Amino acid sequence: VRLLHLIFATQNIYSYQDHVPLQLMDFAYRYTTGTLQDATIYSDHAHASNAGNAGTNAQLTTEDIRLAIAARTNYQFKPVPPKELLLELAAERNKKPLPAVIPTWGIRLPPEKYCLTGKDWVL
Amino acid sequence: TLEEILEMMEDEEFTPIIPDAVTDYYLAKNGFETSDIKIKRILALATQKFISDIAQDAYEYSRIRSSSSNKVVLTMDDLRSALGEYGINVKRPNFY
Amino acid sequence: YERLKRDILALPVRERRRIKAITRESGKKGMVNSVITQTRQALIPKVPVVTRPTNVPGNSVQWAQDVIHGFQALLASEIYELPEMDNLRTRMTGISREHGLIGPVDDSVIEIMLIGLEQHLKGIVEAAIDIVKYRRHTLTIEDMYDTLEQYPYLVEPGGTLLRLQSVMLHDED
Amino acid sequence: HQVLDGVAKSYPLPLERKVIMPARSR
Amino acid sequence: YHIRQQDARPNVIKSLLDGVGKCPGLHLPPHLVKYLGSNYNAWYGAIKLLEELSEGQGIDNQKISDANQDALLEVYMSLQEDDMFYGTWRRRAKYFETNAALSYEQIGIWDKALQLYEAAQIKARSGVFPFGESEYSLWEDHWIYCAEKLQHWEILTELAKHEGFTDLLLECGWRWIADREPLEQSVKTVMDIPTPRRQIFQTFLALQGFSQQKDTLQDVSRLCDEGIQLTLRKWNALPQRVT
Amino acid sequence: MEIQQMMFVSGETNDPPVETTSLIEDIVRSQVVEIVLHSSQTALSRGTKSIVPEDVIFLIRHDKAKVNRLRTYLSSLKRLKTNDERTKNMTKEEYVHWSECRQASFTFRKAKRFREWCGLSHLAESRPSDDVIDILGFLTFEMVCSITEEALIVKMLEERKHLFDGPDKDVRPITSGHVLEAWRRLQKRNVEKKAIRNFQGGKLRSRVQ
Amino acid sequence: SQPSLKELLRNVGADEGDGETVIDGDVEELLLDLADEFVTSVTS
Amino acid sequence: KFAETSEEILHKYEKFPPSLTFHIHENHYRFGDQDGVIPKNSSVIKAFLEYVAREEIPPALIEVTKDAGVQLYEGCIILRIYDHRKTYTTILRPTQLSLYADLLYQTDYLQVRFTDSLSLNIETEILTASKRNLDLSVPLNPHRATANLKPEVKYPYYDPETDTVVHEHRPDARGNMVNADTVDSDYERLMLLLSDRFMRLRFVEAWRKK
Known part of the structure; x- marks a missing residue:
């Protein structure tokens, strides 16, 4: 799609390979199918389905779509930078002292039985 | 048992369809070197078997499609169904 | 290419629709897209206080004493056992009022939730047991990190995995 | 044009948007 | 057995609790004795047990001795003897400002009684003295007992606006045609678990709705009929001799 | 679920209260409605409204096929032999009761109420046959027998003068938690050969048995 | 009213019979935290 | 006149009370004008004391401390502890989480037209530099950025018998050893069945004022 090239133009990336637009459009189709599918399930849920209790009539307001998307981003879609979590977590790590030692001009390795000894693997 | 299975991989009587060179490349990619030949043939074998399983899934799901009791083509519906029945995810292609 | 691209886009009749999308959308009171306000507004407790233009039914006034009580519980991971009903109920009321609902949880929710929980954890530990031994052993942290490297679809990311990669301490310390 | x-x-x-915020920290 | 539904003449609980007190050596828990004696009958079969534990020997535990005294002091309050209520408290209480205010209150001058309660709590609140869990249910409840004996009904209006319970329904109610709609729904939040007091609020607003024609007559006859039968059940739970 | 309680007795064990039987009733109903959902969807994707046996046997598509074929035609193994050999016995009509459960399945005659109690609003333009009703009877019976096996397994894995009022004829084996653990166990996810997409994120899938 | 820890230990004593005794301070805390996160997300 | 030091912040910045005084008498915990008291509740004050045995202000003081004090009360704090077995004081400082909290409570007003990610970012480029005008940017020569003095080493050698040898540090934990730490009056409990065991002074001291 030419409009996908137009959207590429926003990020200064005019060097595509022409498989990307097919692929990303396929992707968005898949994604929105799933989205407005489970939103339709939730529109059914407000319409109180089981093995025969009532009908199924579709409106699909925006709230249902919002629900169907928040569930997806519950386990996907790299969220806002979780800075505070990382700050406190890293303060918990950044708490116990350095070793304050001298291996005296070499490399200090972990002890063997934590080192690997990359021999030819064998039974 | 198990020990027969590495009695057998060594000699030419059982040499997986996947050539030794290609599996060596894919061992190396994902980071494994060893101067044994058994293990590489073995991962070859397991992969051969897994693809055979999706093969039979495709065969039967094609056999259901019409006339239970211009040649055969393993299309996107057959694949959509078998890959789905696995854990392989949804294939929702499109046009326009 | 850019000029020719825009000309070809005008070749389609959607040049008019393209010409109209110049404004700033979200014609609402707002949809902020920043980070810090998302965080803060997703950190303080909320309060479901209600209007009353003509009549707002419910027959049970909204309170935020419940939210404070919910955030004050001796939640799990301090204690050594999965929470018994009462703790979980006290925590839920807090969350329901804090999201903007009203009415008391009805004592069947807690039990189905415990059920799903213990099912979850049995799955996880079965995975780790499938790691360590093929067919007298004793299990460690590293095996669980291994199996949460293999199978991460089990746990939802966030909060704990980052915390998991900040507890792997070395032997002497 | x-x-x-x-x-x-x-x-x-x-x-x-999601916000990664556990129960314990908050 | 649901309500262990005897609730009849010399029944099982009365004959079991009065058989315990005739044998020394067993010492049934005091808030179970208070519950069994009040709910079924045999009030005086319960004071035989809650005085046997208090006097005589000591039980060699402060937390069994203080839970006995609280179980005793709401038996005396239920049977409305105050002279044994106010004499068990000041035998027990530890401050000086509450041994003064309890004794200015069973005499009956309620102006020097309330001053010695607000001067009792400021002996606390970062005071060094520990003051107990009970003796703090005496300060905050007999400040509001004397402040409603003295008829200060505008001060404890704004007090009961904040907590919110039957004390708001009692003082703001009687001290109903124009403010009926806030009063009616606030009754029905507390009209469950009914008592002989709460039916008088339910009946009276059904009577001043009949005055404005909002409520029909017949309903006040049914509301007075099913309310008297609850007043009957509280009379039958009391001892035989009229005190 | 009187038939299920009889079927539960047929497997091995006795004395479920109403709780476990109503729960098992819900279980079987859910399994079966899911089966018919999938089979109807597949047929209509082939382009036919009538529900058929070829789809449904392939819907199971597993060692689940040899036993089902035998049931239609009429209309490891050492253990199932050894346990039955241990059972061999008589009196108070010992072998007699065994037969009851075999010929009291929903497919025996009561096909109508079995059709109606489960979902039937689906496929309003068509209506399936009684052959599939018998089939479902087979599947429901096998599901009840399996569930009971796992419940007993987990139960076992957990490990003065008489006052004459205790009858010494009452036992309490089976309850909600046992069946729940068993039905977790049976949802062994897939053979795990169907969840090999090991390193990723996200998941969803339905399952049977 | 009514006359008034063995939940996890029962969640794990019934998984295996060859010991496999987990350790607190390293493993158990992880699991409790996971459970907490699960309940919070679900009820939200 | 650089003053971004640790011990000097306590030595010089002294003899004035913008502080928060603590109070201890071996059973309760208190600070400031507190009507209430805190007992040994390890859910809270041990989280505090963990930080205060170090020199970090916890992240959470800031917003209440800000809305309380309009000035002369911030930048850092010192805490006034005094026992009843003396008086003692010791200093606490930021951690970059306190600083990020100093940006949060600024977000409860003007959430729109505020260019948060821009303005509240660039704010730190000025603040962080301004807090710290004492950095130690001074090199020193290794054996690696000059010549003629490259040293010798003898750990990564080649024995004639054995293949090669390396340097690998030394724990005390062996194999098949103990893994880690452990997995962690009923007469009175029977004698206390059905026991189930200053706000009304606050609402009357206002009316006695009126």
Whole structure:
């Protein structure tokens, strides 16, 4: 799609390979199918389905779509930078002292039985 | 048992369809070197078997499609169904 | 290419629709897209206080004493056992009022939730047991990190995995 | 012509974002 | 057995609790004795047990001795003897400002009684003295007992606006045609678990709705009929001799 | 679920209260409605409204096929032999009761109420046959027998003068938690050969048995 | 009213019979935290 | 006149009370004008004391401390502890989480037209530099950025018998050893069945004022 090239133009990336637009459009189709599918399930849920209790009539307001998307981003879609979590977590790590030692001009390795000894693997 | 299975991989009587060179490349990619030949043939074998399983899934799901009791083509519906029945995810292609 | 691209886009009749999308959308009171306000507004407790233009039914006034009580519980991971009903109920009321609902949880929710929980954890530990031994052993942290490297679809990311990669301490310390 | 370049300033948005915030920290 | 539904003449609980007190050596828990004696009958079969534990020997535990005294002091309050109520408290209480205010209150001058309660709590509140869990249910409840004996009904209006319970329904109610709609729904939040007091609020607003024609007559006859039968059940739970 | 309680007795064990039987009733109903959902969807994707046996046997598509074929035609193994050999016995009509459960399945005659109690609003333009009703009877019976096996397994894995009022004829084996653990166990996810997409994120899938 | 820890230990004593005794301070805390996160997300 | 030091902040910045005084008498915990008291509740004050045995202000003081004090009360704090077995004081400082909290409570007003990610970012480029005009940017020569003095080493050698040898540090934990730490009056409990065991002074001291 030419409009996908137009959207590429926003990020200064005019060097595509022409498989990307097919692929990303396929992707968005898949994604929105799933989205407005489970939103339709939730529109059914407000319409109180089981093995025969009532009908199924579709409106699909925006709230249902919002629900169907928040569930997806519950386990996907790299969220806002979780800075505070990382700050406190890293303060918990950044708490116990350095070793304050001298291996005296070499490399200090972990002890063997934590080192690997990359021999030819064998039974 | 198990020990027969590495009695057998060594000699030419059982040499997986996947050539030794290609599996060596894919061992190396994902980071494994060893101067044994058994293990590489073995991962070859397991992969051969897994693809055979999706093969039979495709065969039967094609056999259901019409006339239970211009040649055969393993299309996107057959694949959509078998890959789905696995854990392989949804294939929702499109046009326009 | 850019000029020719825009000309070809005008070749389609959607040049008019393209010409109209110049404004700033979200014609609402707002949809902020920043980070810090998302965080803060997703950190303080909320309060479901209600209007009353003509009549707002419910027959049970909204309170935020419940939210404070919910955030004050001796939640799990301090204690050594999965929470018994009462703790979980006290925590839920807090969350329901804090999201903007009203009415008391009805004592069947807690039990189905415990059920799903213990099912979850049995799955996880079965995975780790499938790691360590093929067919007298004793299990460690590293095996669980291994199996949460293999199978991460089990746990939802966030909060704990980052915390998991900040507890792997070395032997002497 | 350039009118469409000047117009193409959409600034799209999502609907909802997640915020990684556990129970313990807050 | 649901309500262990005897609730009849010399029944099982009365004959079991009065058989315990005739044998020394067993010492049934005091808030169970208070519950069994009040709910079924045999009030005086319960004071035989809650005085046997208090006097005589000591039980060699402060937390069994203080839970006995609280179980005793709401038996005396239920049977409305105050002279044994106010004499068990000041035998027990530890401050000086509450041994003064309890004794200015069973005499009956309620102006020097309330001053010695607000001067009792400021002996606390970062005071060094520990003051107990009970003796703090005496300060904050007999400040509001004397402040409603003295008829200060505008001060404890704004007090009961904040907590919110039957004390708001009692003082703001009687001290109903124009403010009926806030009063009616606030009754029905507390009209469950009914008592002989709460039916008088339910009946009276059904009577001043009949005055404005909002409520029909017949309903006040049914509301007075099913309310008297609850007043009957509280009379039958009391001892035989009229005190 | 009187038939299920009889079927539960047929497997091995006795004395379920109403709780476990109503729960098992819900279980079987859910399994079966899911089966018919999938089979109807597949047929209509082939382009036919009538529900058929070829789809449904392939819907199971597993060692689940040999036993089902035998049931239609009429209309490891050492253990199932050894346990039955241990059972061999008589009196108070010992072998007699065994037969009851075999010929009291929903497919025996009561096909109508079995059709109606489960979902039937689906496929309003068509209506399936009684052959599939018998089939479902087979599947429901096998599901009840399996569930009971796992419940007993987990139960076992957990490990003065008489006052004459205790009858010494009452036992309490089976309850909600046992069946729940068993039905977790049976949802062994897939053989795990169907969840090999090991390193990723996200998941969803339905399952049977 | 009514006359008034063995939940996890029962969640794990019934998984295996060859010991496999987990350790607190390293493993158990992880699991409790996971459970907490699960309940919070679900009820939200 | 650089003053971004640790011990000097306590030595010089002294003899004035913008502080928060603590109070201890071996059973309760208190600070400031507190009507209430805190007992040994390890859910809270041990989280505090963990930080205060170090020199970090916890992240959470800031917003209440800000809305309370309009000035002469911030930048850092010192805490006034005094026992009843003396008086003692010791200093606490930021951690970059306190600083990020100093940006949060600024977000409860003007959430729109505020260019949060821009303005509240660039704010730190000025603040962080301004807090710290004492950095130690001074090199020193290794054996690696000059010549003629490259040293010798003898750990990564080649024995004639054995293949090669390396340097690998030394724990005390062996194999098949103990893994880690452990997995962690009923007469009175029977004698206390059905026991189930200053706000009304606050609402009357206002009316006695009126």
